[PDB]
Design a protein around this ligand. Structure first.
Ligand SMILES: Nc1nc2c(ncn2[C@@H]2O[C@H](COP(=O)(O)OP(=O)(O)OP(=O)(O)O)[C@@H](O)[C@H]2O)c(=O)[nH]1
Ligand SMILES: Nc1nc2c(ncn2[C@@H]2O[C@H](COP(=O)(O)OP(=O)(O)OP(=O)(O)O)[C@@H](O)[C@H]2O)c(=O)[nH]1
Ligand SMILES: Nc1ncnc2c1ncn2[C@@H]1O[C@H](COP(=O)(O)OP(=O)(O)OP(=O)(O)O)[C@@H](O)[C@H]1O
Ligand SMILES: Nc1ncnc2c1ncn2[C@@H]1O[C@H](COP(=O)(O)OP(=O)(O)OP(=O)(O)O)[C@@H](O)[C@H]1O
Ligand SMILES: [Zn+2]
Ligand SMILES: [Zn+2]
Lengths: 471, 611, 471
């Protein structure tokens, strides 16, 4: 009944996990000094919740399909394993090695069936087997009822969902990061609770962000180039760093998973879909999607996000390769810090003063003449940027009160030509929702109707030669 | 301090409120003192400043400071009122109170006797010291190199829950200039501000843990308040006081600030720019202060062991200004519930005290004097609960009680020059603005519980600070058994008999006059005598307030009918003979400015000058 | 028989919930970290109270309900379940799956009868059934005595009630949000206790309201528009947000449910009706309506609302898409805060001064922290707007005292002056009442007929296969 996770016994992340999963018992047991321990604990608990609310005697399709993780289980899994990354050769060999060693000792699970199953695929690479295949998500022919996506950012959501629906799938799940910052068109951001930093490729030579590197220069009054600039805008290329591992991604595919509340898929067959969020913890979310045959209802095309803690996005000036440039960054703030600065932000404060209070609030707070220690701390490398954002917010609010307009009318002065104001900070307080407009009607699907096997002869020989030596 | 200090400032007032013009006691009514509200005026200051430049002999300057200080007082009121908006209240109808008055005292004539040559006075005093105190009169053989000798030997300390930087523990002496004394009493100089002295002062270990706020602690506190209300108070005011709370009011702040002096108001004004609200001021943070003077008593003990170092724990400056307007009301309510035969020195003067005990003490009467200083109040948590229970019964408003309670728990102290951190548990002595009041309440409660009903049937009882005197009580085994529940050295008791063993109270003697037949209180001559042998720091110009204080004290000593009694009282206490000549020597010293210059000498400079 | 609710054991909503239901004893039991726990908890208790006080062995109509949550109730229910919305395929499929999941476990709740009834309706879609129906509220033909509406805002109340009374219904109930804010013609508002925010369509791009979004900009000089503006008035479309779910609504249907005390329904038959409010708790109300045949009495056309908490509305200035405008915002205030602010509002107070006092009061109510850490009686994101409202209210009350007038007369200058005054704040204190003028004579009822099946062939086939087996 208890669930064990591989994090420190004195960590401050235990309380966050317990509140997110109140139906389990969580105890720590550390056996590895991993640099991404927090990011793996959330995923481990998510699968147990997912596989508990679905009845047995049902087939589950796995898209990421790391076969080693699903070896010791009672549910029926169909792993879809293409060969398109440098991770794949290592995982396939590991799967074969574990299967051979596990033969005989374990009898409850279908170890014998899996071993014979893998040999059949090795004979000819074009057989759809109950537990394994070498096709993509589109080209798979096996029919099931439940589909599971785990940390998948390399597919188009509307296209992938449609191909699963026509095979008779009525339920889907998605576990991954929050896509809200990418809908605001930011440049760099961070997830301080999971030691994750991401930045655009164009600003990889910055000086004062989470993911950058620069050199030492004495200065130069004059230097030329080979092309004109005058514009710096985000492009379709970003880089992710989860503790110590690098992952390149694209903006177009990330934004495709920010599905609205209700949408219609129209093709040869029509379906009606819904999307809900069931679990949220400081950046990780779990989404459940249901699909039904037919086409009736109406759509509005809006997406709603609920904020349990503060969310900031401001404008900062930084030196990129010796040149001063300005761009936007975003981050998260704990709810306790936000609540304790309500009265301070009633006036105008300098960035220096705001920094001093933030450092003090991070250690102690006085209540009714009594001093107590704060148990909700935040990383110290994000304080300078947060303090700057708060100062800008306070000044903007004061200028709005000093200029009051009439009720029910607007001053467009003739030929209109109204004036626009300047905004330098967006601040979303706890218990506040954000609404955005997206597309809710899809009718275009394209498929590369060709099958190519990336499997190689030397890899086939090693796998066959590895499985031959049965214990 | 209490009656009078060395400069004649004291803690008591100088206005009589307990005097009547009839030969019998008369009950009267307690009234209120109206205070003039300060007002702001800037045009007057501008014109007076310009008129100050054109002509200013002596009084023209004084008008500027009076105008300037008056402006500061108005500004403080305006700023202070805005901070405590959530606690401010209005004036409710007051509960009347009554008090007893006594006839004026009678004194005997005084005759002045003095010598002529001031050098002979020094010789007589030196002869007196050598004959009675041989070891003290032979200590001084060289200069004052105490600082150097303290540096040569290392540092010994007994600390608990403290942190400090070892790289800043260095105690090379600085320049020291003083005047060589003439009296051969070896009174030490004040210590220097070093890290070594700070650690030596905090060599106290009171680490004791008991039940914080559990059932056994509450039971002991409940019994203590029951004894206090049953054996020392009447029942005619409790229900009325509970109905009417005490809250922060504009009149309290206006009256308080107006009573401050010039320099005190200026210091408070400098800390009003970044004014924190009342609920933001921490109540459990203190600062450490060292500047004090060593305390010496007659005898031979400072020539063998080094004396201790005194320290002050100062609270937040804003904490003692927001809530210091409720002290007057607390004093009035406490005096209303006490029995007529039980007295407290608060809100009295020297003359009022004499009139109260004028016809109560006679020769052959037993007097019990007891002090509670030698008691560890930090061991038991019930001593703090009892004070809070008494405060709640007096009618203190509930949110204010939480602020007061926060200062009686875990506190921390810091030394700014060296960055040294200290932590203490439950502590009673501190620098807050309820220290004498709580100590007086605990002193009365302890006496009431131990003595039971013997306190009610008495002629006169006086309680102040850590000292008390009770008339017609002797020492028996019943009080020893009652007080031996935990240990035996909780309190120190001494038996005294009038005209045989004079009672001691607040550094003075209680004597019965012979010509008139009334009791009176006088000061201690030996304590003064050792004090004149204290070196004077160079650059000090306070040699005129001391002469007036000595002149007043000398006159009280030479009253007819008290010379013989004073001789016997000193001998029965210190076992010393020949103090009439010393008093005569003091008389000629306090006769003129030049006669007071014979107690000093040439200036000596040490550890200074690269030559 | 204690009642179990799905809320945290240390929440402050438990005290309010117990006070509104003195007949029950309630303790919490949390199994799911839902974001709308308070909203669902109130609805669960409301149904229990209605069932307890209703006459047993009676037939009840349910309008637009989910037939899965009435499965284990001994009461007789007839569910009117059309297929207008997009959430119906999931609800109907769940109902069929749950019925077949337990066919022998329960032998007294008429499980077999419900299954057999579902068989007939899937055969022919126009037949009637004592437990199921696919018509609308104005098309069902079965007769009974009681009708129940639970969170229904998509019908016109006078028209729907008249059709129910024809069949012989004498008692009805309604559960939902309070309608009072929409009768004041508000522009935006919030329900802080239930984490609900609603806003108009035209101000979805605001900056400092509950439901909005925006983006960073530098601001330019002059913007040429296309047509004239100079008008900003509420429209008929309003967006709701409960937790993380979105619901579109219309003002006309919302205002039709704020019925007066007495009204008449005249047509082929005549009825006399009354409306009363039974339970009210921080925004939810339960309404009871009785219907009788005949026509005799008298009507005045007034509606009365009783305030237990504070109700506030004021004028605020914000920037919409970079342009400054002004509109109105409404919210609720706890009674304790209102009581303790009486002494401060006797003079003129600065908005920044009022904000600091409100923060001090809210932070001080906790009077603890060894056990309940830091709990607030007011959400901190509404303090800025509330503080400004009190400042304007105090200013307006002063001016009336220096402008005293004679008794019984009116000050004019024909050719009169008749000057109006500014009103920027409406503040209803606790233990006060609000009165509105509405309509009380209804004689226009129309039926559109043209009933459609509203069911598809894949959906019917999929459902029939689900319960085609006896086990
Ligand atoms: N941006 C991004 N993050 C991923 C991806 N795959 C996994 N992660 C995250 O990396 C974390 C750790 O990766 P693992 O689950 O241990 O898989 P792995 O192949 O062993 O990777 P490493 O442990 O880092 O060597 C996971 O918890 C994910 O949150 C991906 O494809 N893109
Ligand atoms: N404004 C509005 N609120 C609704 C509506 N339907 C339900 N609500 C409320 O929203 C709250 C959230 O409930 P949900 O999270 O949707 O779960 P549920 O109560 O089981 O109902 P569904 O999931 O929608 O089938 C409900 O408790 C209702 O009080 C609606 O149609 N309009
Ligand atoms: N169309 C697809 N269908 C199913 N699985 C896919 C598909 N495309 C990629 N994958 C799987 O995704 C996993 C890794 O994704 P990817 O191929 O993008 O590696 P990458 O080059 O490192 O880029 P990324 O940072 O997105 O992971 C592989 O296991 C791969 O089999
Ligand atoms: N005339 C009706 N009679 C009975 N039920 C109805 C009627 N009209 C709609 N409903 C029910 O209302 C529920 C949802 O409301 P609606 O049909 O208006 O679609 P929606 O837009 O998703 O919801 P809403 O308009 O409240 O935001 C559906 O379950 C539907 O059965
Ligand atoms: Zn396959
Ligand atoms: Zn029907």
């Amino acid at each position: 009944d208890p669930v064990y996770v591989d994090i420190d016994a004195d960590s401050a992340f235990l309380k966050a996990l317990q509140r997110a999963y109140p139906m389990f018992e969580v105890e720590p047991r550390q056996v590895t000094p991993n640099d991404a321990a927090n990011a793996r604990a959330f995923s481990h608990l998510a699968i147990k919740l997912i596989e508990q609310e679905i009845d047995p005697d049902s087939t589950i399709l796995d898209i990421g399909s790391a076969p080693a993780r699903r070896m010791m289980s009672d549910r029926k899994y169909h792993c879809v394993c293409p060969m398109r990354s440098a991770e794949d050769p290592e995982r396939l060999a590991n799967y074969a090695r574990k299967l051979a060693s596990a033969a005989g000792k374990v009898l409850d699970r279908n170890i014998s069936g899996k071993i014979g199953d893998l040999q059949a695929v090795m004979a000819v690479p074009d057989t759809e087997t109950p537990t394994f295949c070498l096709h993509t998500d589109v080209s798979c022919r096996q029919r099931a009822d439940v589909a599971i996506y785990q940390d998948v950012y390399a597919v188009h959501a509307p296209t992938s969902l449609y191909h699963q629906a026509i095979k008779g799938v009525r339920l889907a799940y998605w576990v991954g990061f929050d896509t809200t910052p990418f809908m605001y068109n930011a440049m760099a951001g961070a997830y301080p609770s999971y030691s994750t930093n991401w930045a655009d490729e164009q600003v990889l030579k910055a000086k004062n962000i989470g993911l950058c590197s620069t050199d030492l220069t004495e200065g130069r009054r004059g230097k030329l180039s080979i092309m004109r600039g005058k514009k710096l805008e985000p492009c379709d290329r970003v880089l992710f760093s989860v503790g110590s591992t690098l992952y390149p991604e694209s903006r177009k595919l990330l934004k495709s998973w920010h599905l609205p509340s209700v949408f219609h898929l129209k093709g040869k067959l029509s379906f009606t879909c819904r999307c809900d969020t069931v679990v949220s913890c400081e950046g990780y979310v779990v989404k459940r999607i249901t699909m039904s045959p037919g086409l009736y209802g109406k759509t509005t095309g809006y997406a709603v996000t609920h904020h349990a803690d503060g969310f900031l996005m401001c404008k900062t000036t930084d030196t990129v390769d010796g040149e001063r440039v300005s761009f936007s960054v975003c981050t998260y703030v704990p709810a306790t810090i936000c609540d304790q600065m309500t009265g301070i932000l009633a006036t105008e404060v300098t960035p220096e003063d705001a920094q001093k209070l933030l450092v003090g609030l991070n250690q102690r707070i006085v209540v009714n003449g009594r001093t107590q220690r704060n148990t909700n701390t935040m990383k110290n490398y994000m304080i300078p940027v947060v303090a700057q954002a708060f100062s800008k917010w306070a000044k903007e609010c004061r200028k709005d009160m000093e200029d009051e307009k009439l009720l029910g009318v607007r001053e467009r002065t003739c030929l209109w030509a109204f004036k626009k104001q300047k905004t330098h900070t967006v601040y979303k307080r706890p218990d506040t929702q954000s609404i955005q407009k997206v597309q809710a009607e899809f009718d275009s699907f394209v498929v590369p109707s060709l099958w190519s096997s990336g499997l190689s002869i030397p890899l086939r020989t090693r796998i066959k030669w590895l499985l031959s030596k049965v214990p | 301090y209490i009656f009078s200090s060395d400069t004649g400032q004291g803690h008591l007032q100088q206005k009589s409120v307990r005097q009547t013009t009839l030969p019998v006691n008369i009950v009267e009514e307690v009234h209120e003192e109206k205070c003039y509200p300060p007002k702001l005026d800037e045009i007057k200051e501008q014109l007076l400043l310009k008129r100050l430049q054109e002509s200013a002999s002596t009084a023209n300057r004084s008008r500027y400071q009076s105008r300037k200080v008056e402006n500061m007082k108005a500004m403080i009121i305006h700023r202070l009122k805005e901070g405590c908006r959530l606690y401010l209240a209005s004036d409710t109808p007051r509960v009347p109170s009554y008090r007893i008055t006594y006839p004026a005292p009678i004194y005997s004539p005084s005759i002045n006797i003095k010598l002529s040559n001031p050098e002979t006075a020094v010789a007589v005093c030196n002869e007196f010291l050598a004959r009675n105190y041989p070891t003290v009169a032979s200590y001084q053989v060289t200069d004052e190199y105490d600082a150097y000798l303290d540096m040569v030997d290392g540092s010994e300390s007994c600390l608990d829950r403290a942190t400090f930087n070892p790289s800043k523990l260095r105690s090379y002496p600085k320049q020291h200039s003083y005047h060589a004394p003439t009296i051969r009493s070896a009174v030490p100089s004040p210590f220097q501000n070093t890290l070594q002295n700070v650690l030596a002062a905090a060599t106290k270990r009171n680490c004791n843990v008991t039940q914080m706020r559990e059932l056994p602690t509450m039971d002991s506190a409940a019994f203590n308040v029951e004894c206090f209300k049953k054996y020392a108070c009447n029942q005619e005011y409790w229900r009325e006081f509970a109905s009417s709370p005490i809250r922060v009011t504009t009149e309290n702040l206006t009256t308080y600030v107006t009573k401050l002096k010039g320099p005190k108001a200026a210091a408070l004004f400098a800390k009003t720019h970044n004014l924190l609200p009342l609920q933001e001021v921490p109540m459990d943070r203190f600062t450490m202060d060292m500047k004090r003077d060593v305390k010496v008593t007659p005898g031979t003990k400072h020539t063998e062991e080094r004396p201790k170092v005194q320290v002050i724990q100062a609270a937040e400056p804003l904490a003692t200004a927001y809530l210091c307007g409720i002290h007057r009301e607390l004093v009035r309510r406490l005096n209303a519930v006490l029995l007529p035969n039980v007295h407290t020195l608060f809100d009295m003067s020297a003359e009022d005290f004499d009139a109260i005990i004028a016809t109560h003490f006679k020769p052959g009467d037993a007097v019990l004097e007891t002090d509670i200083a030698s008691f560890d109040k930090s061991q038991d948590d019930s001593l703090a609960l009892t004070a809070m229970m008494l405060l709640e019964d007096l009618g203190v408003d509930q949110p204010i009680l939480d602020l007061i309670e926060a200062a009686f728990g875990e506190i921390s102290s810091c030394h700014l020059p060296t960055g040294t951190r200290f932590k203490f548990g439950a502590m009673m002595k501190s620098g807050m603005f309820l220290t004498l009041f709580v100590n007086t309440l605990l002193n009365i409660t302890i006496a009431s519980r131990v003595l039971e009903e013997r306190l009610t049937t008495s002629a006169c009882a006086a309680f102040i600070g850590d000292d008390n005197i009770i008339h017609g009580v002797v020492s028996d085994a019943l009080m020893a058994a009652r007080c031996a529940t935990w240990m035996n050295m909780e309190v120190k008791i001494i038996d005294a008999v009038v005209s045989v063993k004079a009672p001691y109270f607040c550094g003075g003697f209680i004597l019965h006059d012979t010509v008139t037949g009334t009791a009176c209180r006088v000061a201690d001559p030996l304590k003064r005598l050792f004090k004149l042998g204290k070196p004077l720091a160079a650059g000090d110009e306070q040699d005129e307030d001391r002469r007036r204080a000595l002149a007043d004290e000398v006159t009280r000593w030479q009253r007819t009918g008290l010379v013989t009694e004073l001789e016997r009282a000193v001998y029965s206490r210190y076992e010393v003979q020949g103090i009439t000549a010393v008093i005569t020597s003091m008389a000629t010293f306090a006769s003129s400015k030049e006669n007071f210059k014979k107690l000093r000498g040439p200036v000596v400079t040490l550890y200074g000058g690269p030559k």
